[PDB]
Ligand binder design. Structure first.
Ligand SMILES: COc1ccccc1-c1ccc(CNCCC(=O)NCCCCNc2nc3cc(C(=O)O)ccc3c3cnccc23)cc1
Length: 330
């Protein structure tokens, strides 16, 4: 069978905690009354949720209500418990309250409101400094939750909210997050297709926090190359082919061998033979102002097949790419 694997940081964080920290299944919820909030307008529909702007009628304060589409009661306790555990973490979204509509009884979570800068105001005047600044901010959130024994598992642009006027960022939607336990085999059918690490794409189930660092590298490539998304696959199978044409086929089969991943017979005759590209081939006149030897080095060390060789979040924060933003913050 498949060679096992261990996270190389924060491996046992959870084992050294009280059961109640990670045994969410047995967490008692106290559901308030959603009438305390008055819906203003719909802001998004998701696969698992529906989000609304609302007003807290006690203090006229602006809030966001997430009405949970029907899942197993476990996955609601999971998300809630993870939000309580992460409360007050740097750049984590804050869970304000937990409520049920009194006539409908469908459960809902209440969050803090973040003012969102238009994407056509962000993309146009993105400096090289702006990409480093917020990348550093996402890594604060990611290194924190990893240090608390949690994986986000759905890191993508949709779930990173940025208030550029206040230069503050927030990692949202924790509905896919899990606790890390050494040896646990996890569900691979998570995250969005473009941001799925190769471990999901091959059904290697013993993954860890480093899954969240593949997604972040996917975002970094998407931004500095002005290509959205960077790995643009038609389906979950072509996604690996899209990846393999950049990272090369050689490191892939060594990855397959090292963990003895039995690979789907669909993959045999579709990947092929592909050299590992040099990143320079992705730069051009209309994107080079964001590209540098430093950013390239940092990018290379996030996108690895072998999840063990990816930088940890705290390794990323110590990379030279961030040296200017580390010193300006002091
Ligand atoms: C400067 O570039 C970067 C540089 C470096 C690294 C990254 C970036 C970068 C790239 C792209 C983007 C995309 N741009 C955000 C996507 C977006 O805007 N997605 C709203 C979809 C529903 C909106 N509605 C709300 N949904 C919520 C759900 C939850 C939850 O489920 O927990 C919690 C809170 C809210 C919430 C809070 N306040 C207002 C609205 C909402 C952001 C940053």
């Amino acid at each position: 069978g498949p060679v096992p694997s261990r996270a190389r940081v924060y491996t046992d964080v959870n084992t050294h905690r009280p059961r109640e920290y990670w045994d969410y299944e047995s967490h008692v919820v106290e559901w308030g009354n959603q009438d305390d909030y008055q819906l203003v307008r719909k802001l998004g529909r998701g696969k698992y949720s529906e989000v609304f702007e609302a007003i807290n009628i006690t203090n006229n304060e602006k809030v966001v209500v997430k009405i949970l589409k029907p899942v197993k009661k476990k996955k609601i306790k999971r998300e809630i418990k993870i939000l309580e555990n992460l409360r007050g973490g740097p750049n984590i979204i804050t869970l304000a309250d937990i409520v049920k509509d009194p006539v409908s009884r469908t459960p809902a979570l209440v969050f803090e409101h973040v003012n969102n800068t238009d994407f056509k105001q962000l993309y146009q005047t993105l400096t090289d400094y702006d990409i480093r600044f917020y990348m550093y901010e996402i890594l604060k959130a990611l290194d924190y939750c990893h240090s608390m024994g949690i994986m986000h598992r759905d890191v993508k642009p949709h779930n990173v909210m940025i208030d550029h006027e206040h230069r503050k960022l927030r990692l949202i939607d924790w509905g896919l997050a899990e606790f890390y336990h050494p040896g646990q085999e996890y569900n691979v059918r998570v995250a969005s297709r473009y941001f799925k690490g190769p471990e999901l794409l091959v059904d290697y189930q013993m993954y860890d926090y480093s899954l969240d660092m593949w997604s972040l590298g996917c975002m970094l490539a998407s931004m500095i190359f002005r290509k959205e998304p960077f790995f643009h696959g038609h389906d979950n199978y072509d996604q690996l082919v899209r990846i393999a044409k950049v990272l090369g086929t050689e490191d892939l089969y060594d990855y397959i061998d090292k963990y003895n991943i039995e690979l789907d017979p669909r993959f045999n005759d579709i990947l092929g033979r592909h050299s590992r590209k040099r990143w320079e081939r992705f730069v051009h006149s209309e994107n080079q102002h964001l590209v540098s030897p430093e950013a390239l080095d940092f990018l290379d060390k996030l996108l690895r097949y072998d999840h063990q060789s990816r930088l940890t979040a705290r390794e990323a924060m110590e990379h030279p790419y961030f040296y200017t933003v580390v010193k300006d913050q002091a």
